[PDB]
Amino acid sequence: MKKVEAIIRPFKLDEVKIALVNAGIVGMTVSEVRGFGRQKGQTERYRGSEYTVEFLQKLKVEIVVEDNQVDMVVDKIIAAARTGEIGDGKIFISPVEQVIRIRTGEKNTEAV
Amino acid sequence: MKKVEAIIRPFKLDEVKIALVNAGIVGMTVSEVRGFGRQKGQTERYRGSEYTVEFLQKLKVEIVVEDNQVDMVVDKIIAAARTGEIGDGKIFISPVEQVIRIRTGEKNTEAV
Amino acid sequence: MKKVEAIIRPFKLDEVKIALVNAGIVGMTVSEVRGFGRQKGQTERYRGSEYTVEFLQKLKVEIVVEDNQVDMVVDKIIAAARTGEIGDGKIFISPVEQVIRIRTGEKNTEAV
Amino acid sequence: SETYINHPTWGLLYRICMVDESQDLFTTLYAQRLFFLVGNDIKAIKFQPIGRTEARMLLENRLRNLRRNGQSQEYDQLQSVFQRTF
Amino acid sequence: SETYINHPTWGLLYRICMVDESQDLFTTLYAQRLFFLVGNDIKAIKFQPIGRTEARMLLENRLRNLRRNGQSQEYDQLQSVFQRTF
Amino acid sequence: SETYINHPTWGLLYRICMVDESQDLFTTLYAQRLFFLVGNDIKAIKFQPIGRTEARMLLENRLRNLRRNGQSQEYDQLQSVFQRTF
Ligand SMILES: Nc1ncnc2c1ncn2[C@@H]1O[C@H](COP(=O)(O)OP(=O)(O)O)[C@@H](O)[C@H]1O
Ligand SMILES: Nc1ncnc2c1ncn2[C@@H]1O[C@H](COP(=O)(O)OP(=O)(O)O)[C@@H](O)[C@H]1O
Numbered sequence: 001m002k003k004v005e006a007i008i009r010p011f012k013l014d015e016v017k018i019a020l021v022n023a024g025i026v027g028m029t030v031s032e033v034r035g036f037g038r039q040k041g042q043t044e045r046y047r048g049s050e051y052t053v054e055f056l057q058k059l060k061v062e063i064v065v066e067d068n069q070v071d072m073v074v075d076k077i078i079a080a081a082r083t084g085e086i087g088d089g090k091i092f093i094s095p096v097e098q099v100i101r102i103r104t105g106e107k108n109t110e111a112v
Numbered sequence: 113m114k115k116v117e118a119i120i121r122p123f124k125l126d127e128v129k130i131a132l133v134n135a136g137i138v139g140m141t142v143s144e145v146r147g148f149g150r151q152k153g154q155t156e157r158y159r160g161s162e163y164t165v166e167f168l169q170k171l172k173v174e175i176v177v178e179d180n181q182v183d184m185v186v187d188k189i190i191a192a193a194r195t196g197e198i199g200d201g202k203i204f205i206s207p208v209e210q211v212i213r214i215r216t217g218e219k220n221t222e223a224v
Numbered sequence: 225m226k227k228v229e230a231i232i233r234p235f236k237l238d239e240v241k242i243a244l245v246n247a248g249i250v251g252m253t254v255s256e257v258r259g260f261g262r263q264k265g266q267t268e269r270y271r272g273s274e275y276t277v278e279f280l281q282k283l284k285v286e287i288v289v290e291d292n293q294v295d296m297v298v299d300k301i302i303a304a305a306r307t308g309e310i311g312d313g314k315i316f317i318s319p320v321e322q323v324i325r326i327r328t329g330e331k332n333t334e335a336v
Numbered sequence: 337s338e339t340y341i342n343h344p345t346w347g348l349l350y351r352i353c354m355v356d357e358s359q360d361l362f363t364t365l366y367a368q369r370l371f372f373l374v375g376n377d378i379k380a381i382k383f384q385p386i387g388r389t390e391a392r393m394l395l396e397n398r399l400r401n402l403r404r405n406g407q408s409q410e411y412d413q414l415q416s417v418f419q420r421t422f
Numbered sequence: 423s424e425t426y427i428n429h430p431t432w433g434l435l436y437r438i439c440m441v442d443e444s445q446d447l448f449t450t451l452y453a454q455r456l457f458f459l460v461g462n463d464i465k466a467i468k469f470q471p472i473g474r475t476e477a478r479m480l481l482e483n484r485l486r487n488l489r490r491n492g493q494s495q496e497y498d499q500l501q502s503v504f505q506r507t508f
Numbered sequence: 509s510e511t512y513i514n515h516p517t518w519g520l521l522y523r524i525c526m527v528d529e530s531q532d533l534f535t536t537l538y539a540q541r542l543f544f545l546v547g548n549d550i551k552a553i554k555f556q557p558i559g560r561t562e563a564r565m566l567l568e569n570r571l572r573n574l575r576r577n578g579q580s581q582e583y584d585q586l587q588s589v590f591q592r593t594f
């Protein structure tokens with residue numbers, strides 16, 4: 001099993017969620033994060049003064065899936081989350097050695 | 113070493129913390145996350161209008177432990193966090209290749 | 225490739241960011257977390273009553289780098305984030321098996 | 337029904353009881369232990385601090401009313417919240 | 423320009439449109455679906471709830487003004503927000 | 509003593525100094541660089557914006573008072589905050 005971790009623009013949440021649910025991926029965890037990278041914030045104005053948001057709001061969506069679901073989940077996330085502009089985000093794949101469902105004590109494939 | 117990552121109901125934090133501390137696990141990191149899964153939000157009413165919380169508040173508790181502590185930590189978390197209702201959450205185990213204590217530069221077992 | 229995950233005092237963000245950018249690490253993700261460990265909160269006073277913050281505010285800075293950048297990134301983070309007092313935080317290294325850039329579909333070294 | 341809100345200073349709060357239609361009693365999850373009364377029907381969210389002694393008494397009062405009403409599920413759930421908190 | 427703010431109860435909100443210089447219309451990302459009008463020029467942040475029907479009509483009005491003005495990029499972007507939201 | 513609070517728009521803020529018993533001066537960690545004066549003794553949290561020039565002058569004033577008082581630890585710590593921030 002693998003953890004799929006996608007850093008996306010927050011407004012893309014609904015699209016990504018629909019895409020995953022449609023692909024039979026029915027559970028996911030979402031965290032708020034700030035991204036720093038090539039995409040810059042617009043040097044804005046508040047009380048008539050300059051400043052820049054340096055760490056931009058993103059969401060991290062985490063799903064644990066079977067090894068043979070990674071490419072499919074990746075493809076779905078990419079199509080739902082992309083805009084073509086810098087700042088679209090990244091997907092990271094890492095190993096998950098065990099999953100346990102807290103309610104039952106069920107493990108692995110039976111816990112997700 | 114392994115990272116243990118538990119998605120729990122937030123009000124279970126104190127119980128889980130006490131269980132871990134009692135089991136001599138004296139450090140942990142907690143993040144706020146939103147879960148989407150089999151557990152649904154109650155279709156509530158605000159200004160006399162319908163809506164559903166789709167992404168429900170959870171906490172992620174992360175602890176890095178020795179390989180031979182995983183089963184023990186898992187058992188403790190499960191007993192403290194379970195309620196028997198859908199939405200109790202999941203535990204994910206993944207590999208940690210190195211730990212460094214920032215204050216000292218101490219590594220691995222000596223950093224946790 | 226490896227994920228480097230540093231739990232730091234939040235006010236150290238700017239120093240760590242400058243150190244990483246100076247070391248040519250130009251992207252990172254930051255989450256807010258609460259730490260429980262050896263460092264205790266100061267037993268404070270609000271409406272003339274006692275209480276303790278048990279879970280202290282930290283930031284988690286995550287960067288995915290090449291295997292041969294880990295020691296360098298670790299050294300930079302440590303020098304920027306340390307204060308010498310308990311509570312300085314920890315760095316965790318874990319494996320990343322694939323990276324995909326959402327905008328392009330670019331992978332691995334070309335996605336970071 | 338688990339209800340949470342975020343306090344700008346103290347962070348995540350958990351509703352320990354629903355005082356009435358317009359009003360909830362919350363406690364801090366990250367600090368040991370603060371209490372706040374929060375209005376439902378207000379555009380600016382205000383956190384009214386509530387003392388620990390008073391918080392305890394308010395829950396005991398509700399516990400007693402729930403058992404008199406035979407609201408045994410709601411009693412059992414509040415009882416466990418009470419035991420955990422106090 | 424993506425703009426977000428955090429609501430203490432509902433969590434992260436996304437600006438669906440800039441009503442004027444002092445005022446933004448936001449929707450909930452985690453709940454389906456609440457709307458809030460929020461002032462820019464205010465030290466205490468107040469979240470004025472806006473009904474779903476009204477939210478829809480307000481966006482349609484803005485859509486129509488953008489196309490009359492030939493603000494086609496801003497129209498296209500708002501159109502996609504509208505389609506996603508309603 | 510590290511003190512933080514969350515601003516609904518700007519996110520996490522760090523206390524750069526304790527102005528008095530009722531009042532703290534905060535700066536943004538994620539934006540470069542906003543300042544806010546925040547009251548301790550208030551149920552609705554209000555964020556009073558403070559200009560960068562003024563923020564600087566206020567800290568310099570406090571620095572000078574700390575060294576006159578021989579509060580050398582508090583001076584050293586504030587000095588490092590000042591250098592980092594300005
Ligand atoms: N090395 C990294 N490790 C972890 N997260 C990163 C890294 N680099 C960038 N990110 C995250 O990915 C997001 C997108 O980065 P950015 O370079 O702005 O856009 P793009 O992915 O289109 O090039 C950032 O906002 C940040 O959250
Ligand atoms: N594939 C997944 N990857 C990561 N987190 C998940 C996944 N599926 C569910 N979760 C998380 O676990 C929580 C519990 O899921 P749910 O299906 O509602 O309950 P249960 O675990 O009792 O079946 C969710 O709220 C979500 O945070």
Ligand SMILES: Nc1ncnc2c1ncn2[C@@H]1O[C@H](COP(=O)(O)OP(=O)(O)O)[C@@H](O)[C@H]1O
Pocket residue numbers: 138139140141142174175176177213214215224231258259260261262263264280282309310311312313314
């Ligand atoms: N086993 C662990 N797993 C994950 N995070 C931890 C663990 N132990 C401590 N932490 C995190 O590291 C931070 C520093 O811990 P602490 O013991 O207070 O300081 P120090 O690292 O200087 O000994 C904590 O606030 C917590 O966020």
